[PDB]
Structures are given as structure tokens and as C-alpha cells.
Amino acid sequence: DAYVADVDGILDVLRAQVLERKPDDIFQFISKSALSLQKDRGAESCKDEQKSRALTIIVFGASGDLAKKKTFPALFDLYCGGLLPPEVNIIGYARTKVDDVEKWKHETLMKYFSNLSERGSHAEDFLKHISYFCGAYDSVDDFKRLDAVIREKENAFKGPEKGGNRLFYLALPPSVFASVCESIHKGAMPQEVGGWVRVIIEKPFGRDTKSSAELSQALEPFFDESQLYRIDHYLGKEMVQNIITTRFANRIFSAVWNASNIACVQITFKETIGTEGRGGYFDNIGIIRDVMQNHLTQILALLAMEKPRSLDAECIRDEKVSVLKCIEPITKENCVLGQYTASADGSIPGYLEDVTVPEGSTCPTFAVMRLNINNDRWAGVPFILKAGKAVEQKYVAIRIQFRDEVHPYGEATQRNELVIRAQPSEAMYVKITTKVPGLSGDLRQTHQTELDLTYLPDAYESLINDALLGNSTNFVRKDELDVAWRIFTPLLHQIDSGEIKPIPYQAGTRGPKEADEFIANNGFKHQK
Amino acid sequence: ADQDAYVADVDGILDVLRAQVLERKIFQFISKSALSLQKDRGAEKSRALTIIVFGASGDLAKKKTFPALFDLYCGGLLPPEVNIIGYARTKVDDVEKWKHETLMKYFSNLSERGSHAEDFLKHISYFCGAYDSVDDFKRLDAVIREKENAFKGPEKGGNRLFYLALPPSVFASVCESIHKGAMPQEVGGWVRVIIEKPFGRDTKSSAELSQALEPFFDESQLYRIDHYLGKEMVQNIITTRFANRIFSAVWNASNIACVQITFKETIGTEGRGGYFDNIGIIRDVMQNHLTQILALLAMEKPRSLDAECIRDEKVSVLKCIEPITKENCVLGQYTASADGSIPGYLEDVTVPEGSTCPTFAVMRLNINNDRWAGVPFILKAGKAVEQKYVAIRIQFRDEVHPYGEATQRNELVIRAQPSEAMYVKITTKVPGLSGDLRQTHQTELDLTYHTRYDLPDAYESLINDALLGNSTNFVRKDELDVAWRIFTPLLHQIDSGEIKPIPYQAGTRGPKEADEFIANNGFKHQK
Ligand SMILES: NC(=O)C1=CN([C@@H]2O[C@H](COP(=O)(O)OP(=O)(O)OC[C@H]3O[C@@H](n4cnc5c(N)ncnc54)[C@H](OP(=O)(O)O)[C@@H]3O)[C@@H](O)[C@H]2O)C=CC1
Numbered sequence A: 001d002a003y004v005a006d007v008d009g010i011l012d013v014l015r016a017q018v019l020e021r022k023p024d025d026i027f028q029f030i031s032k033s034a035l036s037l038q039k040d041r042g043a044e045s046c047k048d049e050q051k052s053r054a055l056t057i058i059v060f061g062a063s064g065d066l067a068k069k070k071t072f073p074a075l076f077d078l079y080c081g082g083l084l085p086p087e088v089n090i091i092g093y094a095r096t097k098v099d100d101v102e103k104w105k106h107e108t109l110m111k112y113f114s115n116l117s118e119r120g121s122h123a124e125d126f127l128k129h130i131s132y133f134c135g136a137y138d139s140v141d142d143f144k145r146l147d148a149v150i151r152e153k154e155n156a157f158k159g160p161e162k163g164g165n166r167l168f169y170l171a172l173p174p175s176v177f178a179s180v181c182e183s184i185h186k187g188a189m190p191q192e193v194g195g196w197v198r199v200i201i202e203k204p205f206g207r208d209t210k211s212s213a214e215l216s217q218a219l220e221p222f223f224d225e226s227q228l229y230r231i232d233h234y235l236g237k238e239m240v241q242n243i244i245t246t247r248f249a250n251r252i253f254s255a256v257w258n259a260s261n262i263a264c265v266q267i268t269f270k271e272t273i274g275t276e277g278r279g280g281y282f283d284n285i286g287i288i289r290d291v292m293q294n295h296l297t298q299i300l301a302l303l304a305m306e307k308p309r310s311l312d313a314e315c316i317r318d319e320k321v322s323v324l325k326c327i328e329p330i331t332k333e334n335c336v337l338g339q340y341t342a343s344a345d346g347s348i349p350g351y352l353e354d355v356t357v358p359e360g361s362t363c364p365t366f367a368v369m370r371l372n373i374n375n376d377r378w379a380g381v382p383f384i385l386k387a388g389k390a391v392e393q394k395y396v397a398i399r400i401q402f403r404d405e406v407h408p409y410g411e412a413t414q415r416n417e418l419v420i421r422a423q424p425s426e427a428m429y430v431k432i433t434t435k436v437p438g439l440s441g442d443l444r445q446t447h448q449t450e451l452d453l454t455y456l457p458d459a460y461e462s463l464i465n466d467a468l469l470g471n472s473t474n475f476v477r478k479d480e481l482d483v484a485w486r487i488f489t490p491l492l493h494q495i496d497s498g499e500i501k502p503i504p505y506q507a508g509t510r511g512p513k514e515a516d517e518f519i520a521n522n523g524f525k526h527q528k
Numbered sequence B: 001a002d003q004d005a006y007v008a009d010v011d012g013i014l015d016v017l018r019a020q021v022l023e024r025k026i027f028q029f030i031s032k033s034a035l036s037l038q039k040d041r042g043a044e045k046s047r048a049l050t051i052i053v054f055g056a057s058g059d060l061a062k063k064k065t066f067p068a069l070f071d072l073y074c075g076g077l078l079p080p081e082v083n084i085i086g087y088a089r090t091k092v093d094d095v096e097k098w099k100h101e102t103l104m105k106y107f108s109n110l111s112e113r114g115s116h117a118e119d120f121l122k123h124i125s126y127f128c129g130a131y132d133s134v135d136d137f138k139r140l141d142a143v144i145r146e147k148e149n150a151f152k153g154p155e156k157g158g159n160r161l162f163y164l165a166l167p168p169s170v171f172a173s174v175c176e177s178i179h180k181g182a183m184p185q186e187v188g189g190w191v192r193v194i195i196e197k198p199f200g201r202d203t204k205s206s207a208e209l210s211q212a213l214e215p216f217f218d219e220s221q222l223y224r225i226d227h228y229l230g231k232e233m234v235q236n237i238i239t240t241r242f243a244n245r246i247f248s249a250v251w252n253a254s255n256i257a258c259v260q261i262t263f264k265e266t267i268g269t270e271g272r273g274g275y276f277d278n279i280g281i282i283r284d285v286m287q288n289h290l291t292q293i294l295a296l297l298a299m300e301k302p303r304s305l306d307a308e309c310i311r312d313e314k315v316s317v318l319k320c321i322e323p324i325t326k327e328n329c330v331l332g333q334y335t336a337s338a339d340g341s342i343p344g345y346l347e348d349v350t351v352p353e354g355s356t357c358p359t360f361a362v363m364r365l366n367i368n369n370d371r372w373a374g375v376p377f378i379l380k381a382g383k384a385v386e387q388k389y390v391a392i393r394i395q396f397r398d399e400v401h402p403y404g405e406a407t408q409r410n411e412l413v414i415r416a417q418p419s420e421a422m423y424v425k426i427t428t429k430v431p432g433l434s435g436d437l438r439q440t441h442q443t444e445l446d447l448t449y450h451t452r453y454d455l456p457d458a459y460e461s462l463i464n465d466a467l468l469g470n471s472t473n474f475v476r477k478d479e480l481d482v483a484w485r486i487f488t489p490l491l492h493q494i495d496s497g498e499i500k501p502i503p504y505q506a507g508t509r510g511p512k513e514a515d516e517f518i519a520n521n522g523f524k525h526q527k
């Protein structure tokens, strides 16, 4: 029609990832991607055992931001995908008094549902499953009325199986977890006639070894590890679960997955955004506690763990704790911090320019560190963990550099690379060196190419479905969490004591120049 | 003056249009071609070198040699004053009619380089003479030297490359007349001789022919050509094996379960049964091609990228191969196709009755060394089969734990014909929600380095490599001997009637005795 030329808005979406891969101007790449890029639009539109028992999902802190912005929207997308039972009942628990609960669902919630809102109004049928309960988190009596309301919905079930399953979501600060679980234990446990209870716990799981061990001990008398589901927003990503399969279902990758073949392993987490006006409470957490101690450590555990003896959930987790116990605590000389300042053009204000940050504080927004795994498989292999905010690019990936085959080709070849990227675009490719397809020459004419492999909810909604299915594979265990803290706690105390302090770097940079020097000094090689 | 300059290109336009009518099918296609050509074009060192092609009247000279040198000419890989002389016994009366028609009509491309072909043919001369005549070679050496001495450059004399596009029964006399009649100008220059396909038929036959040529040329001058070792993807076999740690670490017996080198053709003998009946499929494509491919696949790490270090290693691994015996081989002879398109092998008039010549052969070779002890190397070749296919199949040992039936053997596949390809088949988890860690599918990660454009043929490397004096992709004297010793005892047993081929109609994969043999020798089938 008139002025509707989104083909210009269309075209640079094609361009954005031709700069991401830049493969030898392959005309097939421009073509073969194009129809798959359009058939993204061509493919979208609006268990037999979970039906068997009534299910109740109780979201504590429904008034909270995480509950309204992704938690309830997560359950919405699971409903449209058919991943929730038809008689599921969702109850929001919060202290704030709200009347006209349909207005609360249709205004303060309906502000933050999925973009499929126009694709279909199944949400109106979804909101009929949502109820609101106002009460306290430390009141045993309030949870008994919650149990009464839940029982009036479990006994409203039309199936023959008795009881009901209760999934409790703690979208609350961790200081409230202990009292909430005590109130559940004393007042709102599942009916004796049948049903399980599972509790999802959100981060931060403490701030050090002593801090987190107290939290797990405060929840011990109420729920075991089969009932506690500490959620990780990255263990649901599809390539990080694929790490297990390519390692252990293929002899090719398994035979070279050791210190006798691998030169360097780097797990990097990059964001172009800063705290952006809300850094006052990131100032007390730091980059290490935010994404390094939990996310990158989880990825490292799957990358370096020994072969599980079965594909059961607790066999995989057993290997994760066993390999993490081979890691020495990180020292201050194996870590370089950073704190981002204002952008050169002034686009992104500096971290200290934030009103909410206490000026003069040394909280790190950037950190690169080396980890050592002392076992037969990984003795001597440098494991580099990198994480920073407000950097040159948005990037979460694994880079595995294999040791160079030196003698036959010399400077005509370089290190092999295995790369697994999860964000923004999923990919796994193996970079090796082949002979140039032009002519013969001296057989020393070579170029580094890559070997790219061919191929409903997001990562967050996968984990909730995993919890509803009883799969604890992608949730960190209590023993697993303690070992991770013991690795990082001695370093974190040095950070708080000022033994190492961040180096300033402008927004949009790769980070401090000392970070890249540290990376190249710990076994990493770059070719351009 | 300019008048003759505008009628030579009109002939040049003609020689492009004359090229296709003798190929295809009349007068309207010449017209419809002409309008294609109008804007087809309209859109916008050191020494003298002599290339002498003996047997220029032969089919190989006109069909594959001269088109080769033509394509390297447009690629700019020959000196500006290169000299090409066609040597043959047959009479030709018209000097340029032989050049402009019977050689240009095997050129390509027709329209975008047809005028470049005209300037290419100005480097080509024809010499009629005998292969055993000292006087004729002295006459040939005279005209060779008197274009060498007209060359303008710092060095003297020139280099001479000899292409023997002749039956092997003439090689001994041709090389003798060169040695005493046409050696390079003594002031300076080298001589290199290309020897075409049929190097004997067993160890004894090949030992006599190579002994018949040593008193004239050493191994640095003798370039025994295999038009598979200039291939793009078997010449890369060396690079991926040794320039990459990932492929080198699994290139042994503890990671590889079965290796298959296969050669498939939909064509039959095609009315030429009298000349394939005395050769056999083993002597044609297996003793030479697949063994050469086997050498590159199984050779140890060379000490350097030097020519004779690569050839030494491919010689050394062949010496670990025990001679093939009859019980590790299954033969086949193709009969008439089901649809009747391809006649049976015995239905040829030129085929003697009751012939047991094999048109199909699958065999297992055992490489007894540390790297390959116990690994079955299966070589398969056959004519008139289901598809045209030349590929390598490397099946890695399956890792059962912890996936069991959720995974299978990894596969590394190298294809060279019809389309070159290279992919590794692996099992990953299916991208799916309730498809859990046990839900997997077989995917692949292919050699996705294509270019903007995309194409020389295998020869054009070999002549160029001969021109550069590489010799890495040419069969050496010792290499040819050890390869013959592997196959000759089996060839004699077939000659003695110990083994007789199993019939199979044209268009099938072959007899099931082949597929039973393949499945019983370490191969596994997925779906
Ligand atoms: N949303 C996000 O982007 C991020 C979320 N997280 C984690 O998710 C969890 C929940 O997210 P979020 O909603 O933002 O957290 P909030 O601080 O906003 O608390 C959520 C709700 O719980 C109640 N609440 C707040 N403080 C207290 C308190 N001391 N005691 C009892 N109740 C309180 C409030 O509801 P009411 O007053 O009605 O009871 C509030 O609306 C957090 O633990 C956080 O660490 C981690 C990284 C990013």
C-alpha cells in the first residue's frame, strides 16, 4: 500500500548475519539462508501422563517483576504449546492486596505477555486458569487456607486419580525462601492420597561458600534434592544440552576430548548492555556472582565432566560434581576485572555515572579468569572464563582450540577449533585447514575453512517443563552448588578486600587491554 | 592489411560455430547459436619450453591432452612463447584444417574463449614421422632447437616435456629415439616424459617395461600419470589427515572400524568387449586407481611435504599389504538389464564365448602395521551398476555407551564423482522440547567451503605439476611394483579359472555375494 516499504526493514535482517559468518561470499549462503529466514515466518503461527493427575502451580510473588514479565508468560507459552494439562490451575501468591482480579490479570499482567497476543486470544482462556491469593510468606495459617483453596481445585479434578501435584515457584528474594518452605511443610504439603511437590528456586543462591551452605541447610528439613529445583537460565539452552550428546554419542569428538588433544577452552559471556540505570544492586553482586559462578561454571562442568554411566538425571549431575571437585580455587593472579565507563560517542553512560551506584565502589562489570582442572583428562589444559557487560558484541559461546599439528605443514596450518554458540544465533562448526581448491602449487597453499553442521518454547520455558516432567538434569544440585562456591569464594573475598581492582574500559570495547593480554598469555591463539 | 585482419576472426567466429554441429545432431541451431554469441562476448616466462605430444592422431591426444593444454593456456600457466608439436605417423594434408576442426571441437568453453582458442592453435605445429626413426627425431630436434634459439630470455636452450599418448608397446622405442636424437639443448634445460595408463598387466610385465625405459630416463624424468591423483579431493586427503589434529588423532585402528573405497559406473563395456575382456575390472580401476587412493588414505605421516617423502610413505604402507587371495574377493559379470537398455556383457560380438572376465569386483585388503592392524579395507568396483559413484567411506567404531541404540557409527565420506563432497556423519540430539537427551538423529557437518564462482580437470594439475617438476602425484617405479605384487597372485588365479564371476543384470548394485561379503567384513548399515 502507501509508504509500506518494510523491504528496507527486511533487507538488513538478512545482512545482520552475513556479517556474523562472512563465509567466502558463498552465493548459496545468501540464497539457502533466505528461504529458511522467510520460512521462519512460514513455520510459525498461533505426555499422556500429566493429564492423569490434577496439577497446581503456585507462583509466589506474583506481584514481582520476574513473575509478571517472564514467569507467567512462560506458563502462557507452555499452555498454547499443549505442554500443560487441560485442568491446570495457576495461583499467584503475594502480599499486596488487589481487587478486581480480572483487571489485574487483564491489565498489569496483560501488559507483559508474549508477542503472540495478536496471533491468538487463547490468553483469555489461559487467564481463566489463573487465581490470586493474598497472604503472608511466614504465616502457617495462611498456607492452610492456601491448602484449602488448592484442595478445592484438586478435588475439582474430573479424573479418577486422587490427590494432586503442586509446583511451587519462589519468585522472591532468597531471604524469604526459608520461611516459605517452612510454611509449605507445615501447612500446604500435597494430599496424602497422591501427588508430588516440587519447588523452583531462583538465584542468587548465596554469595559465598558459607553464605550458600546456610541457605541449603535452612531448606534441608523440608525438601530433599529430588524436590528442590534450583533453576539455571542457561541449562535449558539447546546447544548446552547438546554438549553431552556430541561428546559421548560420537567417537570422533570423544577421542579428542582430553588434554592430549585440546590446547585451550574458552567460555565467554558478552552483553552490549550495561546495568543501564539499575546498577545499585548489581554493585553488591558483581559479574562473577552474576553469570560466572553459576552460568559459565555450569557450562564448564558439562564440557569437562567424565562420561556418565547412564543418561539418568542423577548420573549426569554426579559427573558434574566430580569434575568440579578437581578444580583448584581461582587465585587473584588468574583474574582480571573491569568496570565500564562512558561510551566514546556518549551512547552508553558510564557505570559510575549511574545515580544508584555508590560512587567510588570497585564492583566489577567484567572478569576474565583461568581455571585448572587437575585430573588425567584435563591436566594442563587452560580453561578461560570471560564475562563482561557493555562490550563490543553480544556473544555467548564456547571456543575449543585443539593442539596444533606442527611438523608436516608447519606455518601452512593452524589450530583446529570447535565452537558452540548459544546466543544470539545457535551454531556449532569445526574450523580446520584444507588445501585451497584453486590449483596445485607446492601443496603448502592452504586456507582455514569451517565445517558447519546442517541444523517451540525458549530456554526458560524448557526448564519449567523439565520441572513439571521431573527431570532434574538441568538444575544444579546442592553438592554441585557448594563445590562451585568453594572454587570462587577465595577469589571473591579478595575482590571484596580490594586485593585486585577493576580496570576501566569504555563501553563498546572488547574490554581492558590487560584482559586480552591475559588471554593470549594463557594458551589462546588468534589468526584474524 | 586490416582487410585480412577482419576475415581471420570471421573464420574464428566460424570455427566456434563449426565446433558444435560436429558434436550435436541443423541450420537453425547455428542461427540460434549466433544470437547467443552476440552479447556472449559483448558485455564490457624464463626459458623456452617445448611440449611434444606423441601420437597426436590418437583419441587421447585430441580428446583430453590438447584440451588440457588449451585450458592451462587461458589460465596463464604456460610461458608466452610455449611450443606444442604434434607427433604422429598418419598423413595430414591441410596444415590448419586438422588443427582448427578435429582439435578445436573438443575444446571448451565454446563461446567465451573461442577466440582465445585461435591464438592457442598458433602455438601448435604438426610433425609427421616415425617413432623408431633416428633421422626423423634428428629432424624433429632441429626444428625444436630452431624455435628454442629464437626465444628471448636470459637462459639458453630450453625445456622439453614429452607426452607419450601411445600404446605402451611403443614406449621403449619412443624413449630410445628421444635419448639419442632429441635430448635437451646441452647449454641448459631438462627433459620430462609422461607415461600413459597401461603399465603392464602384472609384476613381471611391469618390471620389464620399467626396465625398458630406465636406460633412457630416471625417475625424476619419468612421470607415470594417474588422472585420479590430480583430483581435488584425493589431493586434499593428505591435508586433512595431517594438517588437522582432529582427523589425525582418530586415523588409526582404535577409532576406525571399516574403510571402503568404491568405484561405480552406470555404463557397460559399450560394444568394446574385445579390449576389456583381456584387462578386467581389477587391472582397469582397482590395481591403479583405488590402490593409489588407498595409499594416500593409509600412508604414515611424511617427514616433509617434499614429493619423494610423500611417495616414500605411500610406498612403505603398500609394502605392508599382503597379496590378495581368492577367498577375500567376489567377482561379477554383468548381464542384460531388466529394461533392456544396456545389453549383457556376453551379448557383445567382440566378447569371446564363455568368457569369465570380471566386470565387477569387491575385495578386502589387510594392512598389517600398528596403525591399521585389523582394519578391513574394502575395495569395490563394477560396471553397469545402479549409479555413478566414486567415494570413500570411513566408518568409525561405534561408541555404545552411554547412548546405546540412540547413536551409531560415525562416518567420514569423501566423494569425488559425480560431485565432490566431504562430510562427517554424527548423531546429535534432535532440536525438540520433550525429545530428551535420549532422542537423537543422525546429522552431518559438511566441508562447506564453496567459493563465489566455483574448474580444472585432474590432468591439468598433472601436466602443470610436470611443468613445475613436482612429481608428488605420479606413480613411482617402486610404488608401481609393490602395487602389482598385491594383485598379481589373485589375477593369475582368475586367469587359471579358479574364480569365476557371478552374473548380475545391468542396473543393480551387483550380486548379493558382494553385499554379503561387504556386510561380513566390518560394514554396518543404518537405513
Ligand atoms: N526479573 C529479572 O530480570 C531478574 C530476576 N532474578 C531473581 O528472580 C527473583 C524474583 O525476581 P523479582 O520479581 O525482580 O524480585 P523482587 O525484589 O521484585 O520481589 C518480587 C516480589 O516479591 C515481594 N517482595 C519484594 N521484596 C520482598 C521482601 N523482602 N520480602 C517479601 N517479599 C518481597 C514483592 O511482592 P509482595 O509485596 O506483593 O509480597 C515483590 O513484588 C529474584 O530472587 C531475583 O534474584 C535474577 C536476575 C534478573
Ligand SMILES: NC(=O)C1=CN([C@@H]2O[C@H](COP(=O)(O)OP(=O)(O)OC[C@H]3O[C@@H](n4cnc5c(N)ncnc54)[C@H](OP(=O)(O)O)[C@@H]3O)[C@@H](O)[C@H]2O)C=CC1
Residues within 6 Å of the ligand: B055, B056, B057, B058, B059, B060, B061, B088, B089, B090, B165, B166, B167, B168, B169, B170, B196, B197, B198
Ligand atoms: N582414450 C582414452 O580415453 C584412454 C586412453 N589411455 C591410454 O593412452 C594411450 C593412448 O590412448 P589412445 O589414443 O586411445 O590409443 P590408440 O590405440 O588410439 O593409439 C594412439 C595413437 O598412437 C598410434 N598408434 C596406435 N597403435 C600404434 C602402434 N602399434 N604403433 C605405433 N603407433 C600406434 C596411432 O597414431 P599414428 O598411427 O599416427 O602413429 C594412434 O592414433 C593408450 O595406451 C590408452 O590405454 C589412458 C586413459 C583413457
Ligand SMILES: O=P(O)(O)OC[C@H]1O[C@@H](O)[C@H](O)[C@@H](O)[C@@H]1O
Residues within 6 Å of the ligand: B231, B232, B416, B417, B418, B456, B457, B458, B459
Ligand atoms: O575419471 P573421469 O570419468 O574421466 O573423471 C575425471 C574428471 O571428473 C570431474 O568431476 C573433475 O572435475 C575433473 O577434475 C576430472 O578430470
